[PDB]
């Protein structure tokens, strides 16, 4: 129901000046409620081991809902908790997620959290992954600039 609520609140094409669809007293209470919901999910999946494994079912939706203009705060931290506290979802990561992460890094400035997430995305719990490392070294650094 939380995911459904987030999806229903995220039907806005820009979530900035589309408040006329809902009406008044909604435009001001948009960024704060989005950040509060993201932080609620964040504190929910933080600390628990089984919860991260249970929630690690649809990472594509989280990846797609990452660079949602204002959604830089939060959301990303949820993925970081999932990666740290559940090192088993790191098996179905295709090039689309890496491209989305690189686009987020180039679009939202030089944020250290993005580099931390990319750092945690290669090495697993004592086992290295050749595919993820090779994908990272050719997409994030295909050259320079």
């Amino acid at each position: 129901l939380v995911l459904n609520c987030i999806d229903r609140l995220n039907v806005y094409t820009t979530a900035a000046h589309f408040a006329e669809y809902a009406g008044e007293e909604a435009a001001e209470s948009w960024k704060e409620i989005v950040n509060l919901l993201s932080e609620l999910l964040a504190s929910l999946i933080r600390g628990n081991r089984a919860n991260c494994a249970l929630f690690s079912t649809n990472l594509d939706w989280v990846v797609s809902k990452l660079d949602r203009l204002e959604a830089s705060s939060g959301i990303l931290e949820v993925l970081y908790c999932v990666l740290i506290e559940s090192p088993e979802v790191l098996n179905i990561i295709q090039e689309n997620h890496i491209k989305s992460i690189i686009s987020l890094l180039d679009k939202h400035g030089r944020n250290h959290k993005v580099l931390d997430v990319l750092c945690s995305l290669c090495v697993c719990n004592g086992v290295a992954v050749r595919s993820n490392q090779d994908l990272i070294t050719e997409n994030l650094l295909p050259g320079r600039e």
Partner: protein, 761 residues
């Protein structure tokens, strides 16, 4: 923007530190390709300039040091550390020329123990095999083509070692001068990275003798002069990480000392066994010269000839003292040498031998006093430092325990037989380095190629103690259980690699006996894992289980019972299954498992007869388990559901010639007849021994009655009386197998018995 700018642009400095962290994480645990890629960006000159510079900030200095460590001196260090617990000595005059070497110059037994790691140590470890980086070489056109991965980029080792030595000298000089400006802004950023670098270089084994002597001198210039100014690191207040680095350094030095000690003991052992062989030859010659005028000639002949060499060696050695008891067939010449060597070895360890601030004048006393001094300081808030400290303290008080742990991993290799040993060790190191990495196509191809290039080694044939030690069978089992289990239906992923593995398992079973038992319990775990997952075709581990118990006569007697229950339950489940792969392969849907049932019957055939006998306990247990479930051995066609065995074999025959139920190399009739032959052979081999034990007990009679009542008469004779093919147009495995008649004869002889009329018929 200038690197040296730390006061401003703090966010940029944090970003660069995290970028270095990402670079180090990418180049972690192998991946020589990204190693070369990073060598393209952060080249050799930049790394050396960042090394030599001292005005750099702390975090960036630590990041650059750890990046250089993880790029250049990482893979070789891991490979050499993975085999630091293995000690192998060859037979060269250099080995005979090295011993404990007491300081006899104005000394003797009551002298120093010598500086550890001064060289002249001999062992068998593979070379690092570096390669210079390059970027003007065109990539091969063929994709991979079983490429042997790559090699880490090479850097000048001597120049790097000299730079590290001068860096540590400058650091200790600055620490002695008590300057208020650290290199990295703190003591940690000044001491930890250089200590980590010098520890990695020391583990590398690049230093010679003068370098190690200088390092030991500058560590503590108080009790290392047997070979106020410049105070050592041991007399300086330092944080926790410096303590960890020094603890690792001391652990490496102690490991080197232990390796030297065990090599010296191996040389002494070779000399002692040579002397013992010479004395035994002389004693045999004198006995041959004078063999008369005696009464215990037969006893002496049985003792020195009709006895295993282990027992003879144990008698001639363990009776040398027996706590001052003698009673040994050896003179009193080598006994004095043995006692002197034992006393010298006990003096070398931490035993006073007399009674059981002060200058230590040694290493063990020095490290013990230093650890006590560190304990006497404030409470340590780092649990890992405390654990390493206590491990180092305990490791330096019980030499007997570490010696007893290290002796099973010691062996002596024949001279001029080191090339094969190096090849085997390099292959094992490659196996481990691919074990620490997740599986995939290229790495499985490399593993298959390596395990196919290890067969022709001329080492695995002999010396079972090499593989009994080390634990490489455990490594193979970990690899295979990683590729097989852990992912439910992921067992079918990556096939065609278990064939070489299973061949290796069977060979390791057939080598020796203790290895046979160990791999027996391990293969029991494997058959459980295969049963939880239905197994696989081809080189099934069930075939390995059948081939492992071909001739033991010891494991089957003490074999468990729940494993048989699991096996028969899996067989019943396969019999009640509909074989989804067979129907998709082009065969009609039949609720029976031909291949699985045949393999299970073949395995059960090899786990009953042992060595031609019949264990009554396992026989009755398997009979009770098999007959407890009526839904077994084909309940719908064997006769349980209301059919007949003769009708079943006639239907199988009618299917066999001109089949129509199936389409395209294994059909149903051959599988049916093979299954029936295997079941009847298993029943015949399960008969309660012979008439020698059936005349005294009633359990054998009851088993015989049940077996006779299970299958009716006038059936085996009718099957035998069925005509065969033309006796020698070409035929293949579709018609009657001549070995079926042998099974019929064996079952008739071992169950029904004999009479006149049936015998003549």
């Amino acid at each position: 923007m200038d690197i040296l700018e730390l006061s401003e642009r703090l966010d940029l400095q944090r970003f660069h530190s995290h970028t270095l962290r990402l670079y180090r994480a990418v180049c972690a645990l192998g991946n020589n390709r990204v190693a070369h890629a990073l060598c393209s960006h952060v080249d050799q000159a930049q790394l050396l300039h960042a090394l030599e510079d001292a005005h750099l900030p702390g975090p960036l200095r630590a990041g650059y040091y750890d990046l250089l460590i993880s790029i250049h001196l990482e893979s070789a260090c891991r490979s050499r550390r993975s085999m630091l617990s293995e000690y192998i000595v060859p037979l060269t005059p250099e080995t005979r020329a090295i011993t404990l070497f007491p300081p006899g110059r104005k000394g003797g037994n009551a002298r120093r123990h010598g500086l550890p790691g001064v060289g002249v140590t001999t062992s068998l470890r593979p070379p690092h095999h570096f390669s210079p980086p390059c970027f003007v070489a065109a990539l091969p056109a063929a994709g991979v083509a079983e490429a042997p991965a790559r090699l880490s980029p090479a850097i000048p080792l001597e120049a790097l070692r000299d730079k590290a030595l001068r860096m540590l000298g400058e650091a200790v000089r600055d620490g002695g001068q008590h300057a208020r400006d650290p290199v990295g802004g703190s003591v940690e950023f000044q001491f930890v990275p250089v200590l980590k670098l010098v520890s990695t270089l020391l583990v590398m084994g690049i230093f010679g003798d003068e370098d190690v002597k200088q390092i030991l001198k500058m560590i503590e210039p108080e009790v290392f002069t047997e070979e106020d100014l410049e105070e050592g690191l041991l007399q300086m207040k330092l944080p926790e990480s410096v303590k960890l680095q020094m603890c690792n350094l001391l652990e490496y030095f102690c490991d080197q000392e232990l390796q030297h000690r065990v090599e010296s003991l191996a040389a002494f052992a070779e000399r002692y066994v040579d002397k013992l062989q010479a004395n035994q030859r002389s004693r045999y010659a004198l006995l041959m010269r004078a063999f008369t005028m005696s009464a215990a000639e037969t006893a002496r002949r049985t003792r020195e000839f009709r006895s295993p060499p282990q027992e003879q060696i144990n008698m001639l050695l363990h009776f040398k003292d027996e706590a001052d008891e003698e009673d040994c067939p050896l003179p009193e010449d080598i006994r004095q040498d043995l006692q002197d060597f034992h006393q010298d070895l006990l003096a070398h360890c931490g035993i006073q031998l007399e009674g059981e601030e002060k200058k230590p004048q040694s290493l063990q006393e020095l490290v013990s006093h230093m650890v006590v001094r560190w304990a006497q300081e404030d409470y340590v808030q780092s649990p890992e430092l405390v654990r390493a400290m206590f491990s180092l303290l305990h490791r330096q008080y019980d030499g007997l325990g570490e010696l007893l742990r290290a002796l099973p991993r010691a062996y002596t290799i024949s001279p001029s037989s080191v090339e094969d040993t190096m090849s085997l060790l390099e292959c094992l190191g490659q196996i481990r380095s691919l074990l620490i990495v997740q599986m995939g196509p290229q790495e499985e191809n490399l593993m298959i190629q390596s395990i196919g290039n290890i067969m022709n080694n001329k080492v695995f044939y002999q010396h079972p103690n090499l593989m009994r030690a080390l634990g490489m069978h455990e490594t193979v089992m970990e690899v295979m259980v990683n590729v097989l289990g852990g992912g439910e239906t992921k067992e079918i992923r990556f096939p065609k690699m278990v064939t070489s593995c299973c061949r290796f398992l069977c060979y390791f079973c057939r080598i020796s006996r203790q290895n046979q038992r160990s791999m027996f319990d391990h293969l029991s775990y494997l058959l459980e894992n295969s049963g939880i997952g239905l197994g696989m075709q081809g080189s099934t581990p069930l075939d390995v289980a059948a081939a492992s118990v071909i001739d033991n006569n010891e494991l089957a007697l003490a074999l468990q019972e729940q494993d048989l229950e699991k096996v028969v339950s899996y067989l019943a489940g396969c019999g009640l299954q509909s074989c989804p792969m067979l129907l998709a392969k082009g065969y009609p849907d039949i609720g029976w498992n031909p291949c699985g049932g045949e393999r299970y019957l073949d395995f059960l055939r090899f786990a009953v007869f042992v060595n031609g006998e019949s264990v009554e306990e396992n026989a009755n247990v398997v009979v009770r388990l098999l007959i407890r479930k009526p839904e077994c051995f084909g309940p719908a066609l064997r006769g349980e559901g209301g059919s007949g065995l003769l009708a079943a074999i006639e239907e199988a025959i009618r299917i066999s010639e001109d089949p129509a139920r199936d389409g395209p190399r294994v059909h149903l009739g051959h599988a049916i007849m093979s299954f029936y032959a295997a079941l009847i052979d298993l029943l015949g081999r399960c008969a309660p021994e012979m008439h020698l034990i059936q005349a005294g007990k009633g359990e054998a009679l009851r088993i015989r009655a049940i077996l006779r009542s299970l299958v009716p008469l006038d059936d085996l004779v009718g099957i035998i009386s069925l005509p065969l093919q033309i006796p020698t147009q070409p035929k293949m495995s579709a018609s009657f197998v001549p070995d079926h008649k042998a099974s019929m004869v064996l079952f008739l002889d071992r169950v029904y018995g004999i009479e006149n009329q049936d015998f003549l018929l």
